[model samples]
Target: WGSIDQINGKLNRVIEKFHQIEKEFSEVEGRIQDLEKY
Candidate 1:
């Protein structure tokens, strides 16, 4: 189960998952945007 390389190779999935979460948390993102500030 050692796979940072695989994870890095498929970073698009990671990005998509975050985008999905933001979609899921529309009210939160809309209300409190700029989470990456921290």
Candidate 2:
């Protein structure tokens, strides 16, 4: 039970990290598109 809980916590952290990276990339992409328009 303890090991499963630890694994779950690690998985949650990994998911959050991925989401943050995705958001950062999306913001960067948007900026690039805006620049292209100009």
Candidate 3:
């Protein structure tokens, strides 16, 4: 494998996972806000 390209690919996956987790984290926060409306 092209070493630089392989590292870049792995870096992209890390960012993708981070974005996915961030999205879910926001969703959970929104749910908590809705629950607090009682």
Candidate 4:
């Protein structure tokens, strides 16, 4: 029953990766800002 709390905190990282991927193709202006950040 406690298996959900196993192996550190990968959900936060996994979910964040999902969000990062979603953002990649969802925003042109945001992508431009990323390129300009460097």
Task: Give stretches of model 1 more than 4 Å off.
Answer: 1-9, 27-38
> How many angstroms is residue 36 displaced in model 1 relative to the true structure, after the best TM-score fit?
25
Write candidate 3's Cα lDDT for 1-38 as tens digits.
59999999999999999999999999999999999996
Better of 1 and 3 by TM-score: 3
* TM-score of each candidate structure, all chains considered together: 0.43, 0.82, 0.80, 0.44
Error of 3 at 32 (Å): 1.3
lDDT of 1 by residue, 7-37 (tens): 7768978898999998879977765666655
Error of 4 at 34 (Å): 19
Count clashing residue pairs per candidate.
0, 0, 0, 0
Could you tell me which 10 consecutive residues in candidate 2 have the lowest summed lDDT? Answer: 29-38
Per-residue CA lDDT of candidate 2, range 1-38, in tens?
A: 99999999999999999999999999999999999998
Provide the overall lDDT of each model, using Cα atoms, as 2-decimal numbers. 0.79, 0.99, 0.97, 0.77
The lowest-lDDT stretch of 10 consecutive residues in candidate 4 is 1-10
Which residue runs does candidate 4 get wrong by more than 4 Å?
1-8, 28-38
Clashing pairs in model 2?
Answer: none
lDDT of 2 at 4: 100
In terms of lDDT, which candidate is stronger, 2 or 3? 2
After best superposition, candidate 2 residue 20: deviation in angstroms?
A: 0.8
Residue range 1-38, candidate 4, lDDT tens digits? 46666533578788889999888767976778899996
TM-score ranking from best candidate downward: 2, 3, 4, 1
